[PDB]
């Protein structure tokens, strides 16, 4: 097929798979915010005896603590595996790195500007 | 290579009379009436360019695929394109490889044709069967009936 | 381009400053680096005639001039004509005002620290860059070749320097640095040609010594096959149109001025040459690195760019080194601007960016930031 | 010990957490205020934890990428 | 005659050029074609030395066999005596 | 395989790291416990050059490393860099997260106390498995031989140790530990070669004495006769090729590095040879069951795959013991993993699936639960 | 005039012996490149093959070598056995 049809695929391709990330990223913070909101609810104890405030103070004292001894745990595992992930990217990027080097060229003046140099007095337009 | 065929591919027959027109600027009096590397090359160094005649072996051998040494009229406005390279810094690798990663909805480290068919009806353009045939031959560089990430990078090497 | 900010890779060199944004291919402008003040007095009024011609300029003028190099033997021996120098290279030649870019300069390992020390303090205050990074010559020629490993022969025009990297790592040990380059060649052949009749005395007419040399000269495969040969046939002499007629033809010469460098006795030095360096300079090595740096000797530097010398030190080396190992010269047609080349790798990358030695800091702890952390 | 060492770290850090519950003494508005101070950390708590589910899950991806690749890699 | 004079000199410039990108050609070329004569020579001791080792390994493989037998038979010839 | 557990076979060893799971033939993954820090300064920038190459990755960069083994003699004397050998055995050569697989360490006899028990901390601690088990090296190496009855002799690369076992009662007071060990010999060997010329110095070139020890040496039939005949005659030395080409020729050192195995005097160690210590080792034992103990004498270890030893050991052992008792010394081909191939089949038994450290044993008495009756 | 005429006569015959001179000299380059670039190829499958079965002898002597002192051993036990 021709070269500019499969450029074109190429763009759409690229624009669909953003709008897809977006979509999905969005989807998940939506549904995240839900179904945390569904985890923990809101209280409303206002006015009760100061024993029972403190019961529930006490309470909650003890639900953080169980919450965040598993969130800095799972917080531990993933910073761990992202250590390794970083040590292996590493690795692969040394195993077959060498002469992958990204070039760029500034030589290639621009076009006009050659055909100007080449033409001279009779290039105005052309 | 192709790149370039794919921006001149937009332009139209004004481009086409517009090289007929410099290549009667140019080439009038010429005992070949066509350009050759070597001949680019002498006139570069005219132009006062002084390149290495190594890459106008690159630069030739990238083109003169028949053997000719040539510029074949379709060639030869992919050359005349090819000159000036406008897109540069071909996007940002990170981005790519975050969107070859929500590319993967099986998540199984290949690219499924399915995911294919649905993202090209998706673009909706005039596509046969022969049209993604053809660009995975293109790209399936390992003839593994995927998009491999190094070969997702390398279809999208440089491409904007 | 665009917004941003380029970085400004300069060389300074011996012979040839080299200079040019960071990304592209070859420099934008190279241009010999010479300061040449007029001699005569001079007759005609308002001709416009300045004090001090550079770069390229006496090159064109250089008849009624005396040239002269501020750079010796790589250490800088006159700092007003190096600032000079390095102001035309900035304003003339590029046209972009350094308070807007950084700069990466080179320097040749082994260097008096005064010398960086001077450099980088004209860097930052006469010139006022954002940034400065120094870097020694022959890593960046490793990084031109596309390796990671390899023992790298970097035969410039003031010195000859031969810097072993294995893995990345250095070793500052078998750095073998020898002060024969390109500038003793001339000289030699300047004073070789004097056996058929042709004296060249001036420091003008060095530069026609120079041309003579870089266009005819070639190093032998063989040395004493050549001396015979050239002694009986006549298919040798290669005849050179001076730049005024009087055509010269060069016999034997051809291959002897070159011929010093794998025989430094020539010009009296004591050391060995540059194919016995380098196996010295390997041999301090490592006993289990000596094969990787045997496969990958890479050669750089304008000296060896002579017709014929990529063969000549691979038959050396395999004289002297042991019959098992491969030995493998990489002698890319680049060679010149090699180090240019890898320089702007080196400041195109993103994990560098980091390294320059900010503005900030050489306020804090003056020029002798430069032997700290930041190198 | 290095293992003594992040075993008392994580238990110091643990403690560092443990902040006083110093309220009883106070009335019922504060009372509530510190009530919803908490909720609202629990809140920050859980939606960190939600994003380290996702990146691990990412985590996890690629480092079956990295495998595939050093398959490739033979 | 002194324009006729001027494109002489513009031709002889061109003439200049000319022979000096010949030249380098030729430099090329050559030197091209004594790389390719060393590097033919040292693929012919590779193919040497390839074969004289295949051979070698197939005759230590015949070794190896009957070494072996030979192994057996003194094994018999052991647990017969114990 | 599928569901079910599947239990860790570790095998610390020292030199050696062998693990593998339960109920195979050899070990998975098989590697030198080597910790190497980089010890130039390194100038290439993102080449991605860590601060500490483990495993078989350090024997493969020891050109520019300190290698440093983290366990001298058993012992561990660098806890940090064993817990670096552990994590890269679990995660990267079996690719197996430990908290859902059982572990069997192995250790050698009469070692510190505060070792075992920082190993076992270790385990149950940072990698956090479901139970640990701690195994005696020569038992496991009787297991895999197929036998119930046997004294062994366990010759590794750290520590030499002599177990007697009868009927599946370990006799304790007569376990002969000795610190002579492959290491030793290494040490002796890089000694020895000196009085040719050849100096190995670096802590890399001990890893090439270790090769050349390997694929030469071995121990002669009769000491004395062998001194003689390679003094006369040339027909034992034998070449080996460097890592960088010069071959060096063996001549003598060939079986007298091995022949201090038999002489620790050689060493300057007061103690006597493999071949004595392991006659005292059944004279220690009861009278009834030393005909048992002489018939099935069990070789195991790396050390003791020198080429002739099994036929040395048995000829001194015959020249020791009572004329009448029949001497038979066990070489199976498998020596160098008999251990492991014991640790797999003890793990694979039911029997013993109730004798693992359980987490809630160790939570409740403390690291110090390693010597109670889960031994 | 005369003598501008010669000399531009002589130019353009020089110019176009150039400029063929330097085309041949481009061909024989490319020529001789490409067969260069094919016997680097057969040199590097020549070296893999010589690593291949240098290998394979080193392997094969070693086993050889265990077997036969396996086979002095057992002999020496036979001999005393009888
Ligand atoms: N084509 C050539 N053939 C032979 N010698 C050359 C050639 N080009 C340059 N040289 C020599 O190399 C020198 C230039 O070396 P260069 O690499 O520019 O030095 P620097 O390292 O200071 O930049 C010149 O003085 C010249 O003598
Ligand atoms: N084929 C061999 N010949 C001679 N010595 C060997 C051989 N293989 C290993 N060794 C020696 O044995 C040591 C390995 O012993 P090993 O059994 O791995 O110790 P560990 O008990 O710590 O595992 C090496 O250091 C080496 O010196
Ligand atoms: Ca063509
Ligand atoms: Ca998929
Ligand atoms: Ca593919
Ligand atoms: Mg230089
Ligand atoms: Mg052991």
Same mark, same amino acid.
């Given at each position: 097929?021709?070269?500019?049809?499969?450029?074109?695929?190429?763009?759409?391709?690229?624009?669909?798979?953003?709008?897809?990330?977006?979509?999905?990223?969005?989807?998940?913070?939506?549904?995240?915010?839900?179904?945390?909101?569904?985890?923990?609810?809101?209280?409303?104890?206002?006015?009760?005896?100061?024993?029972?405030?403190?019961?529930?103070?006490?309470?909650?004292?003890?639900?953080?603590?169980?919450?965040?001894?598993?969130?800095?745990?799972?917080?531990?595992?993933?910073?761990?595996?992202?250590?390794?992930?970083?040590?292996?990217?590493?690795?692969?990027?040394?195993?077959?790195?060498?002469?992958?080097?990204?070039?760029?060229?500034?030589?290639?003046?621009?076009?006009?500007?050659?055909?100007?140099?080449?033409?001279?007095?009779?290039?105005?337009?052309? | 290579?192709?790149?370039?065929?794919?921006?001149?591919?937009?332009?139209?027959?004004?481009?086409?009379?517009?090289?007929?027109?410099?290549?009667?600027?140019?080439?009038?009096?010429?005992?070949?009436?066509?350009?050759?590397?070597?001949?680019?090359?002498?006139?570069?160094?005219?132009?006062?360019?002084?390149?290495?005649?190594?890459?106008?072996?690159?630069?030739?051998?990238?083109?003169?695929?028949?053997?000719?040494?040539?510029?074949?009229?379709?060639?030869?406005?992919?050359?005349?394109?090819?000159?000036?390279?406008?897109?540069?810094?071909?996007?940002?690798?990170?981005?790519?490889?975050?969107?070859?990663?929500?590319?993967?909805?099986?998540?199984?480290?290949?690219?499924?044709?399915?995911?294919?068919?649905?993202?090209?009806?998706?673009?909706?353009?005039?596509?046969?069967?022969?049209?993604?045939?053809?660009?995975?031959?293109?790209?399936?560089?390992?003839?593994?009936?995927?998009?491999?990430?190094?070969?997702?990078?390398?279809?999208?090497?440089?491409?904007? | 381009?665009?917004?941003?900010?380029?970085?400004?890779?300069?060389?300074?060199?011996?012979?040839?400053?080299?200079?040019?944004?960071?990304?592209?291919?070859?420099?934008?402008?190279?241009?010999?680096?010479?300061?040449?003040?007029?001699?005569?007095?001079?007759?005609?009024?308002?001709?416009?005639?300045?004090?001090?011609?550079?770069?390229?300029?006496?090159?064109?003028?250089?008849?009624?001039?005396?040239?002269?190099?501020?750079?010796?033997?790589?250490?800088?021996?006159?700092?007003?004509?190096?600032?000079?120098?390095?102001?035309?290279?900035?304003?003339?030649?590029?046209?972009?005002?350094?308070?807007?870019?950084?700069?990466?300069?080179?320097?040749?390992?082994?260097?008096?620290?005064?010398?960086?020390?001077?450099?980088?303090?004209?860097?930052?205050?006469?010139?006022?860059?954002?940034?400065?990074?120094?870097?020694?010559?022959?890593?960046?020629?490793?990084?031109?070749?596309?390796?990671?490993?390899?023992?790298?022969?970097?035969?410039?025009?003031?010195?000859?320097?031969?810097?072993?990297?294995?893995?990345?790592?250095?070793?500052?040990?078998?750095?073998?640095?020898?002060?024969?380059?390109?500038?003793?060649?001339?000289?030699?052949?300047?004073?070789?040609?004097?056996?058929?009749?042709?004296?060249?005395?001036?420091?003008?007419?060095?530069?026609?010594?120079?041309?003579?040399?870089?266009?005819?000269?070639?190093?032998?495969?063989?040395?004493?096959?050549?001396?015979?040969?050239?002694?009986?046939?006549?298919?040798?002499?290669?005849?050179?149109?001076?730049?005024?007629?009087?055509?010269?033809?060069?016999?034997?010469?051809?291959?002897?001025?070159?011929?010093?460098?794998?025989?430094?006795?020539?010009?009296?030095?004591?050391?060995?040459?540059?194919?016995?360096?380098?196996?010295?300079?390997?041999?301090?090595?490592?006993?289990?690195?000596?094969?990787?740096?045997?496969?990958?000797?890479?050669?750089?530097?304008?000296?060896?760019?002579?017709?014929?010398?990529?063969?000549?030190?691979?038959?050396?080396?395999?004289?002297?080194?042991?019959?098992?190992?491969?030995?493998?010269?990489?002698?890319?047609?680049?060679?010149?601007?090699?180090?240019?080349?890898?320089?702007?790798?080196?400041?195109?990358?993103?994990?560098?960016?980091?390294?320059?030695?900010?503005?900030?800091?050489?306020?804090?702890?003056?020029?002798?930031?430069?032997?700290?952390?930041?190198? | 010990?290095?293992?003594?060492?992040?075993?008392?770290?994580?238990?110091?850090?643990?403690?560092?957490?443990?902040?006083?519950?110093?309220?009883?003494?106070?009335?019922?508005?504060?009372?509530?205020?510190?009530?919803?101070?908490?909720?609202?950390?629990?809140?920050?708590?859980?939606?960190?934890?939600?994003?380290?589910?996702?990146?691990?899950?990412?985590?996890?991806?690629?480092?079956?990428?990295?495998?595939?690749?050093?398959?490739?890699?033979? | 005659?002194?324009?006729?004079?001027? /494109?002489?000199? %513009?031709? =002889?410039?061109? *003439?200049?050029? #000319?022979?000096?990108? +010949? $030249?380098?050609?030729?430099? !090329?070329?050559?030197?091209?074609?004594? /790389?390719?004569? %060393?590097? =033919?020579?040292? *693929?012919?001791? #590779?193919?040497?030395? +390839? $074969?004289?080792?295949?051979? !070698?390994?197939?005759?230590?493989?015949?070794?190896?066999?009957?070494?072996?037998?030979? *192994?057996?038979?003194?094994?018999?010839? +052991? $647990?017969?005596?114990?």
């Amino acid at each position: 097929i021709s070269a500019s049809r499969k450029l074109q695929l190429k763009t759409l391709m690229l624009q669909i798979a953003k709008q897809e990330l977006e979509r999905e990223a969005e989807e998940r913070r939506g549904e995240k915010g839900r179904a945390l909101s569904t985890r923990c609810q809101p209280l409303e104890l206002a006015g009760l005896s100061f024993a029972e405030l403190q019961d529930l103070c006490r309470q909650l004292h003890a639900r953080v603590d169980k919450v965040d001894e598993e969130r800095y745990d799972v917080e531990a595992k993933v910073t761990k595996n992202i250590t390794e992930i970083a040590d292996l990217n590493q690795k692969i990027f040394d195993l077959r790195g060498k002469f992958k080097r990204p070039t760029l060229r500034r030589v290639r003046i621009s076009a006009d500007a050659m055909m100007q140099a080449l033409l001279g007095a009779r290039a105005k337009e052309t | 290579d192709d790149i370039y065929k794919a921006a001149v591919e937009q332009l139209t027959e004004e481009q086409k009379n517009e090289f007929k027109a410099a290549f009667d600027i140019f080439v009038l009096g010429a005992e070949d009436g066509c350009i050759s590397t070597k001949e680019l090359g002498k006139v570069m160094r005219m132009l006062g360019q002084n390149p290495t005649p190594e890459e106008l072996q690159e630069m030739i051998d990238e083109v003169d695929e028949d053997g000719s040494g040539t510029v074949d009229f379709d060639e030869f406005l992919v050359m005349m394109v090819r000159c000036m390279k406008d897109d540069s810094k071909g996007k940002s690798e990170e981005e790519l490889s975050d969107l070859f990663r929500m590319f993967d909805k099986n998540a199984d480290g290949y690219i499924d044709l399915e995911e294919l068919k649905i993202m090209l009806q998706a673009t909706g353009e005039t596509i046969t069967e022969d049209d993604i045939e053809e660009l995975m031959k293109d790209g399936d560089k390992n003839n593994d009936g995927r998009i491999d990430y190094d070969e997702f990078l390398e279809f999208m090497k440089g491409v904007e | 381009d665009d917004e941003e900010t380029t970085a400004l890779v300069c060389d300074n060199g011996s012979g040839l400053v080299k200079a040019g944004f960071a990304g592209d291919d070859a420099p934008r402008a190279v241009f010999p680096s010479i300061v040449g003040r007029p001699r005569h007095q001079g007759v005609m009024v308002g001709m416009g005639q300045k004090d001090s011609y550079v770069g390229d300029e006496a090159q064109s003028k250089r008849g009624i001039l005396t040239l002269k190099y501020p750079i010796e033997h790589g250490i800088i021996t006159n700092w007003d004509d190096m600032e000079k120098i390095w102001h035309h290279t900035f304003y003339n030649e590029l046209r972009v005002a350094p308070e807007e870019h950084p700069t990466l300069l080179t320097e040749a390992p082994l260097n008096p620290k005064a010398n960086r020390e001077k450099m980088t303090q004209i860097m930052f205050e006469t010139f006022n860059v954002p940034a400065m990074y120094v870097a020694i010559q022959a890593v960046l020629s490793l990084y031109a070749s596309g390796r990671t490993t390899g023992i790298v022969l970097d035969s410039g025009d003031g010195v000859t320097h031969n810097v072993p990297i294995y893995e990345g790592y250095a070793l500052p040990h078998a750095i073998m640095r020898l002060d024969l380059a390109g500038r003793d060649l001339t000289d030699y052949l300047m004073k070789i040609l004097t056996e058929r009749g042709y004296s060249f005395v001036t420091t003008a007419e060095r530069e026609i010594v120079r041309d003579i040399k870089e266009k005819l000269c070639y190093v032998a495969l063989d040395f004493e096959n050549e001396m015979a040969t050239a002694a009986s046939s006549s298919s040798l002499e290669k005849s050179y149109e001076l730049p005024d007629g009087q055509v010269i033809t060069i016999g034997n010469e051809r291959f002897r001025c070159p011929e010093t460098l794998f025989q430094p006795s020539f010009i009296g030095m004591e050391s060995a040459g540059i194919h016995e360096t380098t196996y010295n300079s390997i041999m301090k090595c490592d006993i289990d690195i000596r094969k990787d740096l045997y496969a990958n000797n890479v050669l750089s530097g304008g000296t060896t760019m002579y017709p014929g010398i990529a063969d000549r030190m691979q038959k050396e080396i395999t004289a002297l080194a042991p019959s098992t190992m491969k030995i493998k010269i990489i002698a890319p047609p680049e060679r010149k601007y090699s180090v240019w080349i890898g320089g702007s790798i080196l400041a195109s990358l993103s994990t560098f960016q980091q390294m320059w030695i900010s503005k900030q800091e050489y306020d804090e702890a003056g020029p002798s930031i430069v032997h700290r952390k930041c190198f | 010990g290095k293992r003594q060492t992040e075993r008392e770290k994580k238990k110091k850090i643990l403690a560092e957490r443990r902040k006083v519950l110093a309220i009883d003494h106070l009335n019922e508005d504060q009372l509530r205020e510190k009530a919803k101070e908490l909720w609202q950390s629990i809140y920050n708590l859980e939606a960190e934890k939600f994003d380290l589910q996702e990146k691990f899950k990412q985590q996890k991806y690629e480092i079956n990428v990295l495998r595939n690749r050093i398959n490739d890699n033979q | 005659a002194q324009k006729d004079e001027e /494109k002489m000199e %513009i031709q =002889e410039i061109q *003439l200049k050029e #000319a022979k000096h990108i +010949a $030249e380098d050609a030729d430099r !090329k070329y050559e030197e091209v074609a004594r /790389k390719l004569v %060393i590097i =033919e020579s040292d *693929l012919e001791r #590779a193919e040497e030395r +390839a $074969e004289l080792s295949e051979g !070698k390994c197939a005759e230590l493989e015949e070794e190896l066999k009957t070494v072996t037998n030979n *192994l057996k038979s003194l094994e018999a010839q +052991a $647990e017969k005596y114990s």
